[PDB]
Amino acid sequence: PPSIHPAQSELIVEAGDTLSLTCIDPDFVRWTFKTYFNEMVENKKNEWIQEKAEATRTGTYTCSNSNGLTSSIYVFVRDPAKLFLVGLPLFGKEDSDALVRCPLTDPQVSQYSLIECDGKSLPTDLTFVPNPKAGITIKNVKRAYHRLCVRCAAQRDGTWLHSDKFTLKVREAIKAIPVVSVPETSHLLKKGDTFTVVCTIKDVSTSVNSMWLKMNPQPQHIAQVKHNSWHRGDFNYERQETLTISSARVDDSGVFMCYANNTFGSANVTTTLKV
Amino acid sequence: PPSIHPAQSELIVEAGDTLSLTCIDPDFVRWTFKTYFNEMVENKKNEWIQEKAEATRTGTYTCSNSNGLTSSIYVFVRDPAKLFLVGLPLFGKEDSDALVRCPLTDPQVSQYSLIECDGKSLPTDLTFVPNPKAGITIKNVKRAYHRLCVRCAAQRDGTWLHSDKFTLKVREAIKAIPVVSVPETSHLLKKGDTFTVVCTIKDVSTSVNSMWLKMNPQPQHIAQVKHNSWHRGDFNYERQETLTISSARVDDSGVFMCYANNTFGSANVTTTLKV
Amino acid sequence: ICGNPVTDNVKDITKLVANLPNDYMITLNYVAGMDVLPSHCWLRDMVIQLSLSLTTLLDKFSNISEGLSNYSIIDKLGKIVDDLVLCMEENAPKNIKESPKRPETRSFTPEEFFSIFNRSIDAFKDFMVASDTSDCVLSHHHHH
Amino acid sequence: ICGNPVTDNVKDITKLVANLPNDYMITLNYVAGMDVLPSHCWLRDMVIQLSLSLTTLLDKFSNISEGLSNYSIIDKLGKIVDDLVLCMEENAPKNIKESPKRPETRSFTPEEFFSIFNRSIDAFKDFMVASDTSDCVLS
Ligand SMILES: *[C@@H]1O[C@H](CO)[C@@H](O[C@@H]2O[C@H](CO)[C@@H](O[C@H]3O[C@H](CO)[C@@H](O)[C@H](O)[C@@H]3O)[C@H](O)[C@H]2NC(C)=O)[C@H](O)[C@H]1NC(C)=O
Ligand SMILES: *[C@@H]1O[C@H](CO)[C@@H](O[C@@H]2O[C@H](CO)[C@@H](O[C@H]3O[C@H](CO)[C@@H](O)[C@H](O)[C@@H]3O)[C@H](O)[C@H]2NC(C)=O)[C@H](O)[C@H]1NC(C)=O
Ligand SMILES: *[C@@H]1O[C@H](CO[C@H]2O[C@@H](C)[C@@H](O)[C@@H](O)[C@@H]2O)[C@@H](O[C@@H]2O[C@H](CO)[C@@H](O)[C@H](O)[C@H]2NC(C)=O)[C@H](O)[C@H]1NC(C)=O
Ligand SMILES: *[C@@H]1O[C@H](CO[C@H]2O[C@@H](C)[C@@H](O)[C@@H](O)[C@@H]2O)[C@@H](O[C@@H]2O[C@H](CO)[C@@H](O)[C@H](O)[C@H]2NC(C)=O)[C@H](O)[C@H]1NC(C)=O
Numbered sequence: 001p002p003s004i005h006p007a008q009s010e011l012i013v014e015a016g017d018t019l020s021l022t023c024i025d026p027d028f029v030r031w032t033f034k035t036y037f038n039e040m041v042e043n044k045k046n047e048w049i050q051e052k053a054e055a056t057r058t059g060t061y062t063c064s065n066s067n068g069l070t071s072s073i074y075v076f077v078r079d080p081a082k083l084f085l086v087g088l089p090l091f092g093k094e095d096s097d098a099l100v101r102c103p104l105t106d107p108q109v110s111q112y113s114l115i116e117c118d119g120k121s122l123p124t125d126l127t128f129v130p131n132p133k134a135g136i137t138i139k140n141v142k143r144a145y146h147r148l149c150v151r152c153a154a155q156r157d158g159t160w161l162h163s164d165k166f167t168l169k170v171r172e173a174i175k176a177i178p179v180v181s182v183p184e185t186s187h188l189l190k191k192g193d194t195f196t197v198v199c200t201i202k203d204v205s206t207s208v209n210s211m212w213l214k215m216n217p218q219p220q221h222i223a224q225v226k227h228n229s230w231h232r233g234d235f236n237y238e239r240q241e242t243l244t245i246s247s248a249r250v251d252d253s254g255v256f257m258c259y260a261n262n263t264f265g266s267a268n269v270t271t272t273l274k275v
Numbered sequence: 276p277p278s279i280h281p282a283q284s285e286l287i288v289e290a291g292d293t294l295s296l297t298c299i300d301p302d303f304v305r306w307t308f309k310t311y312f313n314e315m316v317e318n319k320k321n322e323w324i325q326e327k328a329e330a331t332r333t334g335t336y337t338c339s340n341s342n343g344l345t346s347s348i349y350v351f352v353r354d355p356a357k358l359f360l361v362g363l364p365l366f367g368k369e370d371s372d373a374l375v376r377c378p379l380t381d382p383q384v385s386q387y388s389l390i391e392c393d394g395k396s397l398p399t400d401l402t403f404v405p406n407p408k409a410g411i412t413i414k415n416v417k418r419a420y421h422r423l424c425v426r427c428a429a430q431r432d433g434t435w436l437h438s439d440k441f442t443l444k445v446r447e448a449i450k451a452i453p454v455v456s457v458p459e460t461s462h463l464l465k466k467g468d469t470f471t472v473v474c475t476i477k478d479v480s481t482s483v484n485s486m487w488l489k490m491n492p493q494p495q496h497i498a499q500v501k502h503n504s505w506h507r508g509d510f511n512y513e514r515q516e517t518l519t520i521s522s523a524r525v526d527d528s529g530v531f532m533c534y535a536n537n538t539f540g541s542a543n544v545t546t547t548l549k550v
Numbered sequence: 551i552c553g554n555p556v557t558d559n560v561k562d563i564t565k566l567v568a569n570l571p572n573d574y575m576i577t578l579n580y581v582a583g584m585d586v587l588p589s590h591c592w593l594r595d596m597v598i599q600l601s602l603s604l605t606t607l608l609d610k611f612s613n614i615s616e617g618l619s620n621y622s623i624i625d626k627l628g629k630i631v632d633d634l635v636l637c638m639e640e641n642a643p644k645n646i647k648e649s650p651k652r653p654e655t656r657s658f659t660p661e662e663f664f665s666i667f668n669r670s671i672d673a674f675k676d677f678m679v680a681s682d683t684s685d686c687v688l689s690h691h692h693h694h
Numbered sequence: 695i696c697g698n699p700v701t702d703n704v705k706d707i708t709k710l711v712a713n714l715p716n717d718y719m720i721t722l723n724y725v726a727g728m729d730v731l732p733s734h735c736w737l738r739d740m741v742i743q744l745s746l747s748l749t750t751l752l753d754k755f756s757n758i759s760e761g762l763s764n765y766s767i768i769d770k771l772g773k774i775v776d777d778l779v780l781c782m783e784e785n786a787p788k789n790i791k792e793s794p795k796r797p798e799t800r801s802f803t804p805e806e807f808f809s810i811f812n813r814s815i816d817a818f819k820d821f822m823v824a825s826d827t828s829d830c831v832l833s
Contacts, residue, residue: 037796039793040789040793041793042791087796088742089742089746089749089776089779091776091780165753167749171780205697206697206698206699206777207697207698208697229698229701229702230703230770231701231770231774313642314645314649315645315646315647316649317646317647362652364602364605364632366632366635366636442605444601480553481553481555482552504556504557505558505626506559506626506629506630565759568765569713569755570715571714571715571718571755572754572755572756573754574715574718574754610718611713611714611716612716613712614709614712615709617709617762618761620713620714621712
């Protein structure tokens with residue numbers, strides 16, 4: 001593998017000071033650097049000079065080989081102003097993890113932890129794992145954490161320092177059957193008169209697939225349906241499927257079903273018409 | 276009559292320069308000065324020295340006599356930055372006048388007029404009368420001018436200059452009888468049961484006097500009434516007079532009138548009760 | 551010549567504030583020493599200032615529909631304070647040698663701004679039939 | 695893995711704007727060259743920024759009652775853009791040597807801010823099944 005001159009796994013350079021890396025290899029290709037926002041900065045020179053190094057240059061640098069070998073060194077560009085790197089939102093799937101992207105530029109600090117952005121108490125079952133090179137990870141995310149704002153905290157020489165507000169947004173792990181409902185159970189009118197039936201679908205996400213059916217010879221699907229959707233609450237999505245048929249006939253008569261299926265289960269409600 | 280040394284009706288002094296007035300009289304009492312905001316500044320000395328004269332000192336200065344005689348001199352304290360003296364609101368009675376208080380500090384300007392504060396066109400029937408010593412007066416105020424913003428403009432050496440925004444607020448000329456209304460015409464219950472009657476008064480101002488009466492032997496007035504008022508629109512005021520009597524009796528029975536009178540006319544609606 | 555200026559429209563302030571950014575600054579020329587001095591010392595001046603501020607405030611909104619919009623409320627709150635300016639005009643004293651120094655230009659949050667509005671309304675309610683013999687001296691800051 | 699992010703809640707923007715001070719500045723890190731460049735060049739970045747901005751915006755209001763309050767609308771508009779961030783995550787390309795220069799911090803009026811919001815919504819609608827091979831350069 002390539003040999004990086006600053007022969008150490010971690011390097012602490014001061015902000016404003018120059019930052020130079022060098023990797024020696026006969027089959028050298030390029031240098032690679034992952035930005036806070038997942039981007040790859042490239043440099044095709046043996047030595048990478050960084051005059052007046054900015055805190056944003058903190059991160060892992062990788063020297064690439066033509067043979068396919070890699071060697072990396074993590075650099076901390078310490079700035080007193082920016083102890084934490086911020087800029088990205090906080091997302092997280094339910095029953096999964098959520099990384100609070102607040103990596104530090106100074107690893108020489110204690111008590112690196114999470115705290116409620118307004119000083120309050122954190123949920124009893126909230127568990128987190130600190131990581132100077134990435135941020136703080138929230139273990140096992142629940143729907144009760146939706147809209148929780150946190151701050152990364154660390155003690156620097158006795159004094160406490162906080163990062164910007166991180167407001168967690170959680171993705172619902174769809175594990176329930178949809179909820180369908182229709183006003184009337186059965187209704188009928190004469191030919192010519194137009195009728196309208198509005199089906200109400202309720203679920204925790206927008207992913208639900210809803211549709212209107214015309215089951216007489218076999219469950220047939222109709223494309224003439226008006227879509228309407230609203231976010232009623234945190235995990236309360238609602239879609240209103242409106243079936244409209246202009247000038248009713250003898251052909252347009254029978255039982256209509258409103259089907260809606262999740263990645264979990266499915267639901268259905270039927271209404272009767274006879275014209 | 277008092278003799279003011281600057282023997283001239285008008286004086287144009289420069290802002291920053293010293294301003295001195297002197298009036299000679301054996302029976303001298305005090306000097307008087309009207310401020311932009313109707314206030315009287317007093318000086319009990321023969322000569323009134325004003326070092327570094329400010330634009331705000333513009334106005335008419337009056338020398339008072341012990342015999343009861345007065346002599347005035349209007350002084351202009353020219354300021355290029357502050358041409359118009361501004362600070363007061365804009366009020367006006369319907370069918371009356373409305374002085375846009377924007378006196379100037381420089382009388383040596385042309386086209387002293389009123390313009391729409393955003394550059395639009397002024398009402399067709401809007402007529403105004405300029406006056407360097409007071410401001411621009413709006414003639415014959417109508418309800419259609421309610422909430423009109425204007426700016427005083429004047430051309431100073433070819434270039435145009437504008438004052439701050441003056442938003443006109445008009446007082447309604449009262450020329451209509453009030454409007455009274457009551458839900459029920461007649462109703463009755465047994466003793467002990469409490470009853471409530473809400474009278475609705477409508478008019479263009481808050482000045483309406485409304486009241487509840489108990490006319491059996493003679494129209495008597497009752498003080499136990501809840502007041503409620505709302506501004507429904509520009510000239511739509513509404514008051515709801517609520518008559519409440521706890522534990523009805525034989526004594527509390529008959530015809531009740533809701534009287535409301537303007538400075539123009541009066542209205543009334545009666546309701547019947549028998550317990 | 552003054553009827554009943556204050557209406558139930560003042561009950562919509564809580565709603566209004568909750569519907570305005572808590573970091574939005576409303577400009578209001580504040581009369582120095584309003585919390586300590588008695589009502590009559592600043593009431594007239596503040597009412598004029600609130601009238602100006604609410605007028606400017608309304609300019610920042612548009613009339614949408616029937617629903618209680620910020621424009622609606624602000625409009626009506628302006629009406630109230632406008633009437634108070636005229637109701638303070640009739641009780642305006644005959645001035646003689648008085649020119650302290652004009653109101654300081656300050657900016658407040660909606661919450662703060664209407665707190666000042668409410669105090670002014672209250673200070674007007676008990677302004678009528680009230681002894682205003684108290685002095686307008688700052689030195690009496692131990693609350694008076 | 696992406697359903698139907700956009701809802702009818704976007705129809706309440708006109709009402710929302712009319713209910714916000716026209717001189718109130720909303721901070722939004724603007725991606726330089728958004729009006730000229732094609733959707734795919736800035737869409738993902740802008741959606742992330744709108745998500746952040748709407749989150750901060752919501753912090754400025756309180757939940758009053760049932761009536762359509764600014765808090766209500768903003769909340770829901772945030773939900774929409776949040777889903778779009780995840781819906782742009784699955785289509786996120788495998789990055790190789792690309793690091794122009796982060797978005798400029800700008801402030802806009804409500805009117806302006808939601809004009810940008812709407813454009814983003816529209817640019818997402820026709821992002822699906824659309825020709826975007828055009829490499830994102832200066833032109
Ligand atoms: C519409 O929703 C209906 C409600 O779930 C559903 O109807 C029928 O539901 C029953 C019971 O849930 C299913 O029968 C099951 O139980 C019987 C014993 O009682 C077993 O013999 C079956 O094998 C099965 O496990 C039916 O399968 C189901 N369909 C019928 C026959 O009506 C439907 O799933 C939905 N659509 C319709 C109307 O088919
Ligand atoms: C309550 O409203 C009442 C009606 O508006 C009013 O009572 C009296 O109403 C009658 C007509 O309904 C008026 O009568 C006038 O005309 C008749 C001829 O038909 C003659 O008696 C006189 O020419 C008279 O002007 C009364 O004038 C009117 N009021 C009187 C004097 O009784 C009440 O005025 C309203 N309530 C009050 C008294 O304020
Ligand atoms: C929700 O259901 C639809 C399937 O729609 C119909 O499919 C029939 C075969 C039958 O099961 C009926 O009850 C049901 O309502 C899934 O979408 C696709 O729909 C087409 C219809 O032409 C089918 O041909 C596809 O097999 C089906 N799936 C695919 C491959 O897209 C949809 O996937 C399902 N949601 C989930 C993931 O549970
Ligand atoms: C507005 O109405 C009030 C009260 O209304 C009563 O006035 C009586 C004179 C009589 O016409 C009766 O029918 C009517 O209901 C007037 O105010 C005063 O009210 C008291 C009684 O509460 C009377 O004793 C006074 O005379 C009356 N006026 C006076 C001189 O104070 C009021 O005059 C009338 N006009 C307005 C708009 O002020």
